[PDB]
Amino acid sequence: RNRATRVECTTIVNGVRRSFYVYANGGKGFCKLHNWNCVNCDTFCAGSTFISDEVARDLSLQFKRPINPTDQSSYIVDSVTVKNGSIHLYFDKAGQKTYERHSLSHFVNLDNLRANNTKGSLPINVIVFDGKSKCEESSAKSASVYYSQLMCQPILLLDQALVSDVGDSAEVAVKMFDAYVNTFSSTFNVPMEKLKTLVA
Amino acid sequence: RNRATRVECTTIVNGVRRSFYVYANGGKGFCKLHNWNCVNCDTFCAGSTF
Amino acid sequence: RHSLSHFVNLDNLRANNTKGSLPINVIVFDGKSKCEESSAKSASVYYSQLMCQPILLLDQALVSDVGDSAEVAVKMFDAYVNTFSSTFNVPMEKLKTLVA
Amino acid sequence: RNRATRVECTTIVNGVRRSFYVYANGGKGFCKLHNWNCVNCDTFCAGSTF
Amino acid sequence: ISDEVARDLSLQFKRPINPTDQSSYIVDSVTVKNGSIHLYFDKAGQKTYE
């Protein structure tokens, strides 16, 4: 009956109503597991069908027929371990303990990633919020569905306090750099103004 | 009949109309004290019915 | 009970802020201005629905006089700086730059 | 409920979230000073409340 | 499997996988004997050669 490829739906984030599309096969197959015209509904690549739990009930109310969701909107992290420049994030999945890995380069500046940014897009699959402020947690929970529908695959939630202490680096490194600069200056007697200009 | 988890409603602040969700259990229990599908409606933690 | 650290800057907490979110469960308003009280009453339901648990209302006049600290502390700091300078005869410009 | 002897809570340490128990009297007696069902809170021993 | 392909495969299979080795390494010294050339490099803090 319907050859449509996109389906419209809406959700509320920060007190405003946004819109997004849901992709469909367009006329081939039925996928009786979740009775929807899906395209390769097992891969998190772009363009694949992704039915979240929060929108599954709304869609099954607009279309008067039962619909089964595929994946939960989001999960809460529990443990993180750094290793050779990589970070693992641990969370539960249907009663099993699992983990996912990502690069440490994205965690240098948290403010561009936390909650509702000015750009309106997320560079990575995680989000950072304060565990004490109820409002921040609620806003993150609300935006989780929207950001998990804009791009496929669920969203992982990170508490700011937990990840705050794992990024340490070292001011000892700064002191070693200062010692190296002092040794270099003693070797060649370089004027201090250029040294400080580059040191900044 | 309804498995919905969120319910929409609106209110007026500073002359403009905002929106917010209300959380619900989604199909378990009835809570005859206030005849609504609530989830642990005694704690002020996040995600609880209010 | 709550921590005193949140009460250092009232303007980020009073009524309808620019951010649109509240850091703590209380709100501050002027008791004389009818409009401020009405706006606080109106925003109370919205902010008590955005996050769980009720909202407590604080009058600005009542809490204004409880936060006192001391300029006596400032004077004691100045006396300490004077004693330190007399101990070592430090130039005044850096002292004032840090004193600001 | 919440008259029970044991209460479970969680806290964050280093990089892992941990859980722990909180003890109570089970219902017998009540403390006005602490507003809690504390047992021998003035001394330190196994099974005490803190 | 390398890291540059491990992430893509994990995304395709919707579950984490563990890469086995790095993609490339850098040679630091060269030795030539009996018409053959020897290349040396460090792997995981240990000296290696071919």
Swiss-Prot record, chains B, D:
Binding positions (Zn(2+) 5): C31, H34, C38, C41
Region of interest: ZF2: 31-41
Catalytic function, reaction form: Thiol-dependent hydrolysis of ester, thioester, amide, peptide and isopeptide bonds formed by the C-terminal Gly of ubiquitin (a 76-residue protein attached to proteins as an intracellular targeting signal)
Membrane-protein topology: Multi-pass membrane protein
Subcellular location: Host endoplasmic reticulum membrane
Coiled-coil region list: none
Activity regulation comment: Inhibited in vitro by GRL-0617.
Subunit-structure text: May form homohexamers. Interacts with N protein.
Role noted for this protein: Responsible for the cleavages located at the N-terminus of the replicase polyprotein. Participates together with nsp4 in the assembly of virally-induced cytoplasmic double-membrane vesicles necessary for viral replication. Antagonizes innate immune induction of type I interferon by blocking the phosphorylation, dimerization and subsequent nuclear translocation of host IRF3. Also prevents host NF-kappa-B signaling. In addition, PL-PRO possesses a deubiquitinating/deISGylating activity and processes both 'Lys-48'- and 'Lys-63'-linked polyubiquitin chains from cellular substrates.
Protein name per UniProt: Papain-like protease nsp3
Organism of this sequence: Severe acute respiratory syndrome coronavirus 2
Lineage of origin: Viruses, Riboviria, Orthornavirae, Pisuviricota, Pisoniviricetes
